[PDB]
Amino acid sequence: MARKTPIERYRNIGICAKTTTTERILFYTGLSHTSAATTTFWRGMEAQFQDHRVNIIDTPEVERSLRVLDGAVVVFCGSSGVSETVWRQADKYHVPRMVFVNKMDRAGADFLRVVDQIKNRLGANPVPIQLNVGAEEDFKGVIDLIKMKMINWNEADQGMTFTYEEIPADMIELAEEWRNNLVEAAAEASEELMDKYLEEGELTEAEIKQALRARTLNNEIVLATCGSAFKNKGVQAVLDAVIEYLPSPIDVPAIKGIDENDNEVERHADDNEPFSALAFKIATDPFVGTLTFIRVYSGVVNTGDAVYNSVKQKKERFGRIVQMHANKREEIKEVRAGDIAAAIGLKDVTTGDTLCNSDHKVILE
After folding, report:
1. Does the annotation flag 18 for ligand binding?
2. Binding of GTP: at which residues?
3. 285 annotated ligand binder
4. What does the alpha-carbon distance between residue 118 and residue 77 come to, in Å, rounded to a whole number?
5. Is 103 labeled as ligand-binding?
C-alpha cells in the first residue's frame, strides 16, 4: 500500500491571531476544488501548482500546538497591529512564519506601520512581498511585488477570479522601493545570488521565490502580505504564499523524543521510519464517542494496527480513522508521516500522549 500525495505537497499550518481568515480559507479552497484540524486543498489562484493538502490546525498547550504545525500564518489587524508571547515561543521552536496584515479596509489601517512594528517590537526581519493599493474604504487590492502587477479580484465572484493589471502611476516609485528591498532580501540567501544581484541588478521570479522560501525556512525572515477578508481581497494570495513559502513536513527538523534509556532521539518525516505520533486534541462526539486528533511524524498507521502509548506504557489498537474537511468527513484507512487525522474510539489516550511502534518506543512530549 503506497503513498498517494507526495509529502512535499502537505502544509500543516496554524492561523495565529483568525475566525474570519480561517472561514475565508475554507470558502476559497472549497469552491476551487471549532474543529481541531481541517483538511483543505489548494492548487493556487491560477491552478499553477499541483494540489496541496493544507491541514489547518486550530490554535489557542501553545508549545504543543507549535510542534503540531510546521509553519504559521501570523495575522495582525491593520489598525492596531502588534502575539508577543506567542512569537517568542515560535522563535524558540524555530517555526517558520509569514505575516498577514488583515482588515486593511478599516479605519486607521497602515500596512507598512504594522510591518515596521514587527521589526521593532518583535525583533524580527520582515520583508514585504506585497503593498496595499489604498487603505480604509480606499483599499481595492494589492500589488504582488514579485510579479510587479496589481491584483484585481472580481467582486461578483467573491474573489474567485482576478485579473493582473499594471501598477497605478502614483504607486510605481513606492512599489519599486519595496521590490528593491525584497530583491536584496533574496540576494543574501547565497554567494551566487549576491554575485548576480551586484552585477545585473536583478533576479528572476524563480530565483527570488526560491531564496525567500529558503530564508523563511531558516527563520531569517518573515514575508508579509496584506488584505481584507470581508472585501474578498487577500486571503486567496495568502494561500498561494503558504504553498510558495511555508514548509512541507520534510522542510523542518526531525521531531525529537526520549527513548527508554532517557536519551534524546529523533524521528524523521519518512514513511519507512518507525511510526510515531502525538495526540494533540481529544474531542467528544455524540455518535462516535471520542475523536483523538494525531499528528503523525514518522512512519504509517493503519486501521487495525496495534500501537503503543508510550506515556501510559500500554498498547492501543486503532479502529476507524477520519479527516475533517470543511463540509464532510473522509473516512480513511491509513495516516502517514506528515499528516493529521482523528482516530475514533481509542480507549485510553490523553492529550499529549505519544503513540508509536512497540519495537521503537519513544516519548515525544
Report:
1. yes
2. 58-60, 102-105
3. no
4. 12
5. yes
